[PDB]
Design a protein around this ligand. Structure first.
Ligand SMILES: NC(=O)c1ccc[n+]([C@@H]2O[C@H](COP(=O)([O-])OP(=O)(O)OC[C@H]3O[C@@H](n4cnc5c(N)ncnc54)[C@H](OP(=O)(O)O)[C@@H]3O)[C@@H](O)[C@H]2O)c1
Ligand SMILES: NC(=O)c1ccc[n+]([C@@H]2O[C@H](COP(=O)([O-])OP(=O)(O)OC[C@H]3O[C@@H](n4cnc5c(N)ncnc54)[C@H](OP(=O)(O)O)[C@@H]3O)[C@@H](O)[C@H]2O)c1
Lengths: 333, 333
């Protein structure tokens, strides 16, 4: 365990342990993210880093770290890392794909059903005591929500997570429309998902679920204009990234009935608070917990430990994001 | 439009109209259940009646009802009608089956997922501004919920709804197990469901969903004994009837920790208030909104009328609950 590695947050012990035997591990104890200052300090002698999607690994971080040769992102997304810069510096950047697919997929559908049926609102009605108080028990017109079975779901970004969401959608016998960068005949037939241009999908879909990474090409992909294309009774689910949606536009689309409601797990700024958004009833919110499942986090901690260790052994990491960096340097310390 | 029909509550316009040209309709207009007396008074010269769950239609009601010949229940469950006496008095009783099947199955899953993933508690942490306030964006051990995909779902009651819940589960690649009055080969194969002893189903399921009618046999089917039998990590979902569960035992099983959580749509008293339960964070509650979907309450409405409009024409109601009554008297007024 000669190599040094800093882990920016308390991850599953199963992972730390695995590293304890090949690396000299240091871990950030405090619950709240590591201060930007304190971070540029720790990375001084480290050879590898295990970062959260919260840390901004930009050039500054790279500069204040001469021995850093691999950064293991404890997440599947990496928009919080300066990939290109890292590749030029011969630095390997890994993420944790697959191991968290079902966790995220399950939550999307949780937000879809909950948002379409008023679970979160009804619960407040029952819990608070207002249900008892009002005296009425069961009314023919209360809490009317949207059907989900047999309806049309539109998946934007048919990758690992998106495909998972389509499988669950098959249980509900929904019609599956999807918009992604390419058409994968093999996937389409298997899940029976029909490709359609984003404008058609947002026009025909009863549920629109975002499963794309955050890129310059997906930034605010869902804007005011796009929201208008949507049915007044459609719902928008976002377990992707906050910035993929123009929050101001959404609040408007909601407050003005352009769409029925929205279920959000990700926000443009985290933690997040928005009085006008949070005031709505046809909105379901969750603190970025897409992957908050016992299995997912466990498998994430293991995958992270796998990459670094493979690296130590001069092996091409299992889940390397920037493969081009392979030619700019060799894996090792 | 000679026949007279009293409708206990305001239900979808589509129904009131279909009958409008076949019956002399009167619609109780208060959101709260009709008081005992007022109901007794109103049911004097009524030839038909449209009731809601909450309406306790016993012999006392049949007495003040000299012209009552049919009772259409705006619901699929009829544990609120003294069927025996109904038959004895030659009164036909119909319900609204199937039309609300998917609406209820959907919610069953809304609950299963929302309970398994702290959706209700997440929305609170986030919505109240408590998330921003705490200043921590994302932590590897926050809101860890239970995986669902690939897990075992045990369905108590494999009827129209319980089967709809199985299909839904196929979408999450769940291992389907069910306990029910009778094994149905045709259905088992189709859904790939395995019949199992109630005792086994409760020891092997990660999720237990109740979908049985309320009967002398099902009263408190789930009690302290059975609760204890469930996995310490299992979740109980009840969209059947409140009385099928021993509320007090569940509270304990939750606090004590015999099981992980419960999503309840129905209770022993409705409206319901229980300080002890309502203070648990591993319990998701909804005001008995199982069939509250536009299409459902809509279809249910057309069926009620459909049954009444066919009876008037001297025909056996499409969804007659008591077939035994066809003999005790023919169809008609
Ligand atoms: N809420 C949570 O806790 C949580 C958990 C996990 C992930 N996430 C977020 O959601 C994402 C899920 O991605 P994944 O794990 O499924 O990775 P993935 O398999 O790479 O999926 C990404 C999909 O988006 C497509 N895509 C990319 N840019 C696009 C564009 N401009 N227009 C249309 N489609 C585009 C990709 O197409 P190609 O095949 O051409 O690349 C691919 O189909 C993560 O990257 C992260 O941002 C959130
Ligand atoms: N929460 C809501 O808003 C909502 C909405 C609709 C319905 N519900 C509830 O759901 C119930 C069932 O609806 P459904 O359409 O599924 O009716 P169903 O199909 O007639 O009944 C479902 C199954 O329950 C089984 N069963 C009955 N007693 C049993 C017992 N003691 N042990 C094991 N299995 C038993 C029946 O067996 P058999 O095949 O032998 O009959 C049937 O297979 C309704 O009565 C109502 O209480 C709730």
């Amino acid at each position: 365990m000669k190599p040094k590695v800093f882990i920016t947050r308390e991850i599953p012990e199963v992972g730390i342990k695995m590293l304890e035997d090949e690396f000299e591990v240091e871990v950030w104890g405090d619950e709240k993210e590591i201060p930007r200052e304190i971070l540029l300090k720790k990375v001084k002698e480290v050879d590898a880093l295990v970062t959260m999607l919260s840390e901004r690994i930009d050039k500054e971080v790279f500069e204040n770290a001469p021995k850093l040769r691999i950064v293991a992102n404890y997440a599947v997304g990496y928009d919080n890392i300066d990939i290109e810069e890292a590749t030029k510096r011969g630095i390997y950047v890994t993420n944790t794909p697959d191991v968290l697919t079902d966790a995220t997929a399950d939550l999307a559908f949780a937000l879809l059903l909950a948002t379409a049926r008023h679970v979160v609102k009804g619960d407040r009605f029952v819990r608070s005591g207002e249900w008892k108080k009002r005296g009425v028990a069961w009314h023919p017109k209360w809490f009317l929500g949207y059907d989900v079975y047999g309806k049309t779901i539109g998946i934007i970004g048919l990758g690992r997570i998106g495909q998972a969401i389509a499988k669950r959608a098959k249980g509900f016998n929904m019609r599956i429309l999807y918009y992604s960068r390419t058409r994968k005949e093999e996937v389409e037939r298997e899940l029976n998902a029909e490709f359609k241009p984003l404008e058609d999908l947002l026009r025909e879909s009863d549920f629109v679920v975002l499963a794309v990474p955050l890129t310059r090409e997906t930034y605010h992909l869902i804007n005011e204009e796009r929201l208008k294309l949507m049915k007044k009774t459609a719902i928008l689910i976002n377990i992707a990234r906050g910035k993929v949606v123009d929050t101001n536009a959404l609040v408007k689309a909601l407050k003005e009935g352009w769409i029925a409601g929205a279920g959000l797990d990700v926000f443009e700024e985290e933690p997040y608070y928005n009085e006008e958004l949070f005031k709505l009833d046809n909105v379901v919110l969750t603190p970025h917990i897409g992957s908050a499942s016992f299995g997912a986090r466990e498998g994430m901690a293991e995958l992270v430990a796998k990459n670094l260790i493979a690296f130590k052994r001069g092996e091409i990491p299992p889940t390397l994001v920037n493969r081009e960096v392979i030619k700019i340097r060799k894996p090792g310390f």
